[PDB]
C-alpha cells in the first residue's frame, strides 16, 4: 500500500486536504478528502505537471499529460493522466471528495507524487465544450487553490 | 537533466525558495536558493521523510533515513540521506544556500521528490553533540518553515 497527501491553499481562504491510497502499483488510486471556501457548484480538479509553486499555482504549468493526449473527463479514454473531473461544492462551500481513478498512479510513469493538485474557479467541461480550449483545459478558469502532492505515512 | 523546487513557509515570518538540479542519474544534486526571516547564525536544514503538511511541518515526520543510519553532517559517511547540514543567516536574517550533495537524489530509492524540506530553529550539531538526540535530530529544535519538494520544469 502506497499513500500520498496534498494540502490545498488559496485565497478565500480556500482550504483543502486530499488523501491518496494505492493498495498495489498496478491498481487504482482512491482519492478522498474535503475542500472548503469555494462557491456552490462544480470546480475542475486536476493534477498539473510541475510541483512548482514558486510564484503560486500558475507555476505548476499545464495538466499532467505524459502520454500527449487531449483533455477529457476521468471516464474518458482520451484524457490527460491528470484529468480528475470536477469536485462539487454545497451551499456551505464545502466539497467532499470521493474518487477512484485507474489512470493516475503513486509509482511509475504516471506517478503524481511531486506534482501539483489544483482546484479551479469554474466547472471542467470534460472536453465536451466544443472549443479548442475545451480539449486543453476544459474551460475550468483560474486556479483557486493548489498544493504539491507528497508521500504520506 | 532533472530539476526540483521547494517553497518554504511556516506559521511565522520564515520564507524560502530552494532549487535542486541533478545533471546525471546518480550524479550530485546542486541545491541553491534563499531563506529570509530567520535569526542570525546556523539553522539545521534537512529532508524529512513525508511530504505531509496536513497539520504543518510536524506532519513531515523524522529525517529521511531509508538506510537506517544515525544522524550526521552531509560530509559524513554516517548520516541520514536527508542530512544537509545547516544554512547560515546573516544579521539581515537572510541565508543564501549553495550546497552540492552526492547522497540525495532526484530519482531512485534516495529520491527526495515528494518529501519535505525543513529549516530549523537552531543549529544542527551534525551528530557531534554527544547526547542521544544529537545522533537523531542534531539538536536543531523546532521547525520554522517547510515545503514539499516538487518536480520542476
Ligand atoms: C469504496 S470507498 C469509496 C472510494 C472513493 N472513490 C474514495 O475516494 O475512496
Ligand atoms: C560549482 S557551483 C556551486 C555548487 C553549489 N553547491 C550549488 O548549489 O550550485
Ligand atoms: Cu487544473
Ligand atoms: Zn486535462
Ligand atoms: Zn529536522
Ligand atoms: Zn538527520
UniProtKB/Swiss-Prot annotation, chains A, B:
Gene3D superfamilies: Superoxide dismutase, copper/zinc binding domain. The modification N-acetylalanine is found at residue 1. SUPFAM superfamilies: Cu,Zn superoxide dismutase-like. Its cofactor is Cu cation; Zn(2+). Zn(2+) binds at residues 63, 71, 80, 83. Its main location: cytoplasm. A lipid is attached at residue 6 (S-palmitoyl cysteine). Pfam families: Sod_Cu. Changing residue 4 to V: In ALS1; severe form; reduces structural stability and enzyme activity; increases tendency to form fibrillar aggregates. The ditryptophan cross-link at Trp-32 is responsible for the non-disulfide-linked homodimerization. Such modification might only occur in extreme conditions and additional experimental evidence is required. Palmitoylation helps nuclear targeting and decreases catalytic activity. Binds 1 copper ion per subunit. Binds 1 zinc ion per subunit. The modification N6-succinyllysine is found at residues 3, 9, 91, 122, 136. The keyword Oxidoreductase applies. Keywords: Acetylation, Amyotrophic lateral sclerosis, Antioxidant, Copper, Cytoplasm, Disease variant, Disulfide bond, Lipoprotein, Metal-binding, Neurodegeneration, Nucleus, Oxidoreductase, Palmitate, Phosphoprotein, Ubl conjugation, Zinc. It catalyses: 2 superoxide + 2 H(+) = H2O2 + O2. Belongs to the Cu-Zn superoxide dismutase family. It is linked to Amyotrophic lateral sclerosis 1: A neurodegenerative disorder affecting upper motor neurons in the brain and lower motor neurons in the brain stem and spinal cord, resulting in fatal paralysis. Sensory abnormalities are absent. The pathologic hallmarks of the disease include pallor of the corticospinal tract due to loss of motor neurons, presence of ubiquitin-positive inclusions within surviving motor neurons, and deposition of pathologic aggregates. The etiology of amyotrophic lateral sclerosis is likely to be multifactorial, involving both genetic and environmental factors. Spastic tetraplegia and axial hypotonia, progressive: An autosomal recessive, neurologic disorder characterized by loss of motor abilities in the first year of life, after which severe, progressive spastic tetraparesis develops. Affected individuals have severe axial hypotonia, hyperekplexia, hypertonia, and myokymia, reflecting upper motor neuron involvement. Cognitive development may be affected. Destroys radicals which are normally produced within the cells and which are toxic to biological systems. This is Superoxide dismutase [Cu-Zn].
Amino acid at each position: 500500500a502506497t499513500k500520498a497527501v496534498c494540502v490545498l491553499k488559496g485565497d478565500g481562504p480556500v482550504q483543502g486536504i486530499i488523501n491518496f491510497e494505492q493498495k498495489e502499483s498496478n491498481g487504482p488510486v482512491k482519492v478522498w478528502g474535503s475542500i472548503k471556501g469555494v462557491t456552490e457548484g462544480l470546480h475542475g480538479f486536476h493534477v498539473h505537471e510541475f510541483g512548482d509553486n514558486t510564484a503560486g499555482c500558475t507555476s505548476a504549468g499545464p495538466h499532467f499529460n505524459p502520454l500527449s493526449r487531449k483533455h477529457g473527463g476521468p471516464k474518458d479514454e482520451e484524457r490527460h493522466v491528470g484529468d480528475l473531473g470536477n469536485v462539487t461544492a454545497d451551499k456551505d462551500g464545502v466539497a467532499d471528495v470521493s474518487i477512484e481513478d485507474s489512470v493516475i498512479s503513486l509509482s511509475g510513469d504516471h506517478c503524481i507524487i511531486g506534482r501539483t493538485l489544483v482546484v479551479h474557479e469554474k466547472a471542467d467541461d470534460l472536453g465536451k465544450g466544443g472549443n479548442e480550449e475545451s480539449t486543453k483545459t476544459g474551460n475550468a478558469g483560474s486556479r483557486l487553490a493548489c498544493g504539491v502532492i507528497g508521500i504520506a505515512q
